[PDB]
Amino acid sequence: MSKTRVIYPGTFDPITNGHVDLVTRASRMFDEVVVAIAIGHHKNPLFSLEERVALAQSSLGHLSNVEFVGFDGLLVNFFKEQKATAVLRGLRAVSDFEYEFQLANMNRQLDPHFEAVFLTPSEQYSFISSTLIREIARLKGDVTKFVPQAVVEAFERKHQQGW
Amino acid sequence: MSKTRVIYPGTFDPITNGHVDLVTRASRMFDEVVVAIAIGHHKNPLFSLEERVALAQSSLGHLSNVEFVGFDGLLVNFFKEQKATAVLRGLRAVSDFEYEFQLANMNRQLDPHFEAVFLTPSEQYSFISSTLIREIARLKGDVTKFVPQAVVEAFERKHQQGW
Ligand SMILES: CC(C)(COP(=O)(O)OP(=O)(O)OC[C@H]1O[C@@H](n2cnc3c(N)ncnc32)[C@H](O)[C@@H]1O)[C@@H](O)C(=O)NCCC(=O)NCCS
Ligand SMILES: CC(C)(COP(=O)(O)OP(=O)(O)OC[C@H]1O[C@@H](n2cnc3c(N)ncnc32)[C@H](O)[C@@H]1O)[C@@H](O)C(=O)NCCC(=O)NCCS
Ligand SMILES: [Cl-]
Ligand SMILES: [Cl-]
Ligand SMILES: [Mg+2]
Ligand SMILES: [Mg+2]
Numbered sequence: 438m439s440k441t442r443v444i445y446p447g448t449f450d451p452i453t454n455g456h457v458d459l460v461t462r463a464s465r466m467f468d469e470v471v472v473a474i475a476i477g478h479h480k481n482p483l484f485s486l487e488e489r490v491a492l493a494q495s496s497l498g499h500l501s502n503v504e505f506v507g508f509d510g511l512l513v514n515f516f517k518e519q520k521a522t523a524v525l526r527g528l529r530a531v532s533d534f535e536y537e538f539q540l541a542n543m544n545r546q547l548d549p550h551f552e553a554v555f556l557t558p559s560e561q562y563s564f565i566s567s568t569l570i571r572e573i574a575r576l577k578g579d580v581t582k583f584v585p586q587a588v589v590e591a592f593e594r595k596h597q598q599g600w
Numbered sequence: 601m602s603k604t605r606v607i608y609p610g611t612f613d614p615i616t617n618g619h620v621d622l623v624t625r626a627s628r629m630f631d632e633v634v635v636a637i638a639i640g641h642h643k644n645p646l647f648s649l650e651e652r653v654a655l656a657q658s659s660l661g662h663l664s665n666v667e668f669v670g671f672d673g674l675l676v677n678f679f680k681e682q683k684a685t686a687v688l689r690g691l692r693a694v695s696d697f698e699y700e701f702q703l704a705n706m707n708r709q710l711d712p713h714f715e716a717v718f719l720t721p722s723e724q725y726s727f728i729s730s731t732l733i734r735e736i737a738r739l740k741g742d743v744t745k746f747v748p749q750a751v752v753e754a755f756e757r758k759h760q761q762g763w
Contacts, residue, residue, distance in 0.1 A: 438631050440601075462715060466685055468601050522629055528718070534697045538720045545722065552625060555691070555718040557701045559708065 441522040443554070446473040446512055450482040451588045452493045453570055455562035459527045462556060464500045471519060472497065476509040483571055488591060495587040513547045523552040529563060604685040606717070609636040609675055613645040614751045615656045616733055618725035622690045625719060627663045634682060635660065639672040646734055651754060658750040676710045686715040692726060 445460060449472070464470050474489050482489070486507045497503050508515045516524060524544075528534050541553040558565075565583045574580050574592040581589050608623060612635070627633050637652050645652070649670045660666050671678045679687060687707075691697050704716040721728075728746045737743050737755040744752050 438603075441604075441629060466604060466715065466717070528697065528701075531694050531697065534691065534694065538691075541720050542723050552629065553720065554629070555720070557704050557716065557718070560705050 440469065441467040442469040442471065442520065443467045443523045443525045444471045444473045444516065444519055444521045445525045446475055446508070446515070448477055448480075448482055448567065449474050449489050449493055450477075450567050451484050451489060451570070451584065451591065452496055453562075453565050453567060453584050453588070455527065455529075455558055455565045455583075457496050457585065458559055458562050459525070459556055460497050460503060461500065463525050464502050467522065468502065470500075470503045470525075471521070472503060472505045473515065473519075474505065474507045476507050478509050483595075484591065492585070492588055492591060496585045511547070513544050513551055516544075516551055517548065523554050526553060526555050528555045528557050529566070603632065604630040605632040605634065605683065606630045606686045606688045607634045607636045607679065607682055607684045608688045609638055609671070609678070611640055611643075611645055611730065612637050612652050612656055613640075613730050614647050614652060614733070614747065614754065615659055616725075616728050616730060616747050616751070618690065618692075618721055618728045618746075620659050620748065621722055621725050622688070622719055623660050623666060624663065626688050627665050630685065631665065633663075633666045633688075634684070635666060635668045636678065636682075637668065637670045639670050641672050646758075647754065655748070655751055655754060659748045674710070676707050676714055679707075679714055680711065686717050689716060689718050691718045691720050692729070 443463060445463060447456065449456060460470060460472060472493050474486060474493065476486050490505050490507060493505050512524070526537050528537060537555065544551040570580050570583055580592065606626060608626060610619065612619060623633060623635060635656050637649060637656065639649050653668050653670060656668050675687070689700050691700060700718065707714040733743050733746055743755065
């Protein structure tokens with residue numbers, strides 16, 4: 438029996454309670470979990486790579502089997518570099534499901550060793566996404582219930598700097 | 601690090617190439633896989649429990665980490681009896697996805713330890729289901745491409761007995 442290593446890729450812009458839930462659930466089922474934060478070199482995140490990693494390590498660092506790594510390029514190249522057992526994704530909605538099904542098959546064609554496993558969210562997180570959180574915060578709403586406290590504060594320090 | 605045990609529940613009536621693919625993929629990612637064949641005490645399968653188990657062991661017995669077990673009752677009770685890490689399901693279509701999402705949440709309410717992981721099929725199996733296979737065989741079509749050879753023969757021995 439070998440050691441299992443799953444990658445959880447994402448922009449994590451920012452990390453939410455939903456992502457925390459998934460990573461905790463995955464950490465119980467596999468030997469190593471890598472939170473893989475897509476840099477977004479052409480794709481414009483609100484929070485920088487450094488902010489995103491730090492926000493993630495603050496919510497999940499207490500789990501000893503979870504690593505945190507920024508990446509760019511083709512997910513299958515990252516998959517091979519990392520020697521991963523699988524990629525993990527969460528599935529919140531039908532459109533997620535259909536995109537994810539297509540990506541899994543495309544990746545399996547690029548690399549026959551590729552594998553994708555999916556979790557569905559607990560219902561209390563099923564309505565939460567990074568995009569929507571950004572939108573409420575930007576309009577000065579309160580996102581405390583949907584994100585860790587460190588993310589709450591990070592939104593204030595964006596309001597207060599201008600970047 | 602503990603030993604992982606996932607249950608793959610199903611009627612497996614009969615097992616298809618799609619199910620074989622999923623179980624092989626799961627066997628690489630977890631320490632033990634249990635093919636859990638729902639007896640169907642009120643729910644009328646074409647093939648008996650004994651036929652279904654045998655057909656499954658014939659396709660998958662070569663994998664040393666796969667067990668085969670009939671069960672009835674509440675899947676969460678089976679989950680606890682088996683001391684499982686998770687239940688595994690395949691997701692072929694949108695309607696699958698929505699039923700599975702609801703069942704995972706219902707089960708998580710019955711037992712907070714419950715967990716469900718999902719795989720999507722390779723595209724060459726994405727159109728295959730037990731129900732459709734039964735239907736083609738019943739109308740004397742050829743199911744050789746969609747099922748292991750032992751299942752082909754089992755359909756002949758049903759044509760030739762009458763049960
Ligand atoms: C798809 C990319 C951008 C990352 O995904 P995304 O931008 O959607 O990230 P985000 O952090 O918002 O979501 C992360 C994942 O967790 C899931 N998730 C998020 N929030 C929740 C929640 N509350 N509950 C459950 N699941 C959730 C998402 O559905 C997603 O699978 C990334 O994988 C990537 O760029 N990959 C490399 C590029 C590539 O190779 N692309 C094409 C060829 S493959
Ligand atoms: C849902 C039951 C009947 C089994 O599922 P089902 O009858 O759909 O079995 P079947 O063998 O056809 O499918 C098995 C699984 O593999 C998947 N699958 C089948 N063929 C393929 C394929 N070609 N590719 C990918 N996935 C596939 C299915 O989508 C399904 O998840 C069973 O779980 C059950 O009865 N559980 C206990 C009852 C219970 O507790 N029910 C309600 C309270 S939870
Ligand atoms: Cl996003
Ligand atoms: Cl069926
Ligand atoms: Mg998201
Ligand atoms: Mg089926």
